[PDB]
Amino acid sequence: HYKTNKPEKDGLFCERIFGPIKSGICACGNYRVIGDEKEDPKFCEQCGVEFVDSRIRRYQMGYIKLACPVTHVWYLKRLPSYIANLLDKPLKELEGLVYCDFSFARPITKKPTFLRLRGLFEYEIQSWKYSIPLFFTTQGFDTFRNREISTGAGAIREQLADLDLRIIIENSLVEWEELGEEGHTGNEWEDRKVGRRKDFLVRRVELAKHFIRTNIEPEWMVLCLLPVLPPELRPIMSSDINELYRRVIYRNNTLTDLLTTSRSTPGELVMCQEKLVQEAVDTLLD
Amino acid sequence: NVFSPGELIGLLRAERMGRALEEAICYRVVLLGITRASLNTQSFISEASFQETARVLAKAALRGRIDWLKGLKENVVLGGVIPVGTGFKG
Amino acid sequence: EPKFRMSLAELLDESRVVPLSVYGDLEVGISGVQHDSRLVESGDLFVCCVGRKTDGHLYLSEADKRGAVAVVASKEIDIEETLGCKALVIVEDTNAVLAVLAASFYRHPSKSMTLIGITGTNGKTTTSYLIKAMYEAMGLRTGMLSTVGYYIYGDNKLESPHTTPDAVLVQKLMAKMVHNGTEALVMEASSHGLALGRCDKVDFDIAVFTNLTRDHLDFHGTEEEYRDAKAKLFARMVDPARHRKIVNIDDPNAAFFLAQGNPDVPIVTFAMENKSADVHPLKFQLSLFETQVLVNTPQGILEISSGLLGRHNIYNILAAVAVGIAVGAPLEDIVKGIEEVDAVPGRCELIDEEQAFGVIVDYAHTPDALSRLLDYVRELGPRRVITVFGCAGESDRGKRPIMAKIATDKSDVTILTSDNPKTEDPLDILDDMLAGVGWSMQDYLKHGENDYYPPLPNGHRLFLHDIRRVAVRCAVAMGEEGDIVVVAGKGHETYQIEGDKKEFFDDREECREALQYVDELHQAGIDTSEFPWRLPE
DNA sequence: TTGT
């Protein structure tokens, strides 16, 4: 709080969501003793803060709901890209679709698709879409656009979700068996390209085989919700952790405001704010 | 199905698999430098988290590795009795 | 002014309502007594309702729970425990109580003004409205009740959940209409409504059948039961040279029903091929817009009504011509009836009036109706026929394999989409539907991944989508000059329920908007010849 | 930087 030194409600240091700042004291102003013989309410009706020792602030976590999904920096932007390994699409295409406004034609392969674009990277939205949205009911257009061309962070999640690891390992084994017949006979450049492709295929096979039997889903590589560290661990004197947290919170609430304002809002503004949110998440993580 | 190209296995394990399996296993000796060796261990928290922490952490997280604390630094990080000397139950 | 002669004990006593056990008198104020508990209101006497589903005791219990003043039952009923008036009367006869539920003055007006009953297997509602329009053009205002809406008298129709409303409530509404706002109260019910007892407890001036066949065979348990019930109801109240027996002579049930009853009633046949009926089209003007025929009969009118169907609509027009000529011998009075028949009513709605290919809406919720409508459209259809329909979630799934095959057989291009999910996965029922033609959802999708979408071995193309709106839009955008599109999901319904949520967006206006806006997609360059649409770049 |  301003010139009060008190935790703000529904904030980074909020007492309600994390816990009380003092042992036995609460934000409502009435002290209580935990474990007393007399019946005592665990939490004040007036104030959400529970009556407990303030050690919880050390071990208690939080989470910010994100309107637009974000992609983990470790999986995407490392030189070995697990996302680019699973999705045979090149790394440059994914980095563009994440950071530079582009479009992916078919992000879902398990649902019916009327449009026959079937393209990897759509460098522009100049394709006729205004006549298509007016023709169909506008609500209907919204309903199918997800199976249609998607942008930013929905295509990656739909590709990771709608995917058959068995088909992936089958196709990779087939391509491995095909390659290597006479590649070594060629030049050093061609042999190097064949070798790199073969190594990429082997890594893809290994990743898919591990994903099959590890009770872990590749869907979780793109973060729908971001956890928040316990308050005590980032105590405000103020830390950068918390500065980046405030930045991503501000960008996310601005994005949510723009989304909830009206559907007729310009796509450029919400897309730029999505890029800003994803860059803030990247700076926070790594 | 048993092994993939480019993998690293143990010499005794490779010989025992070659004796048992008719499937041709082509393996050649790679002398591994001290650093490389550490980065390739059974524990992702003791020897893998010494030079490239984030890389091995992301790899173990995506794989879902399970580490059995049979090493010293593993119990050191966990804050428990190290299975050395008086910590070895016999 | 809901009813009259139902707010006094003497009125019920004069109606031969003998319950053998009563407390005090029916001093409670009630506009019209209703046998059904739902039709009755609080503080109103409710007589016992006779029915297979609800007996007299259950009806009396429901009336006492709803707050009816009087409840009739075989045993002692404690109606005064949760009612506004302590006076009640328990009648041990359920049928007699249901008959006496309608007031004497209420039942006398509807029986004296006029009455026209039309109970047919197929094409009954098409002839009922035609007869109503003919009677209105004759100079007497009247209403015809249908399965969709209960209309005792008047142009307006009150909302009713069941196909046939309560007899007492229908009589009360007919009396209220005949008191002011209606000159005649004709009670028309289908075969099931006539067999239940809705139109049976009413003096019918004219009781003709549009199509006599096996109706309610699974419910009644015996063939020709509805026809026998209609004949008995007509013989109960019959007058000389007043009842009309206009029906197709080819149907044996029609002749069996005409044989029963008073022989002094006028009998006539509306068959076209039969020479004894003297009716015949004698014209070749069949078309999707209007099918005019020059009927040459001594009793029937010269001009005929423009029907959308080839044989069903023609038979309905021929059956209605007799009722139109019975009132007036001049054929000029049948112009309004012909216009109302060509007005494209609810059932099997005609094509839109916009400049475009044929787009028809049909209620093909059964395989037999779907195949019949497809044959009717193939008869008229000069070119490719496109159909779009869906099954119902939790409906009999036995229907699903056959229908898809029946559609793929006749139609060259078939688009399947989920008309009513009804708490079942849309893709889950589409797979069961495609199982009839031999395909699975995994294949379709794999074929779908391919641009090819290989055509059925018979040479027809099958297409699948999960959203009904986009499917209807693609079907209405994929058309030729002579090609026709047929929507068979909901002919006379505009409610779409996916799970718990219910939406009313589905309507014919959605299809008309597609025909209106297809010009933009055509100018832009989108290709709708196949389901994988080619787009620029 | 130095080398990996």
Add this chain to the structure above:
DNA sequence: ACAACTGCGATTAC
């Protein structure tokens, strides 16, 4: 892209 001795103590500047 990654890493390059181990710790301790003092000050001033934020």
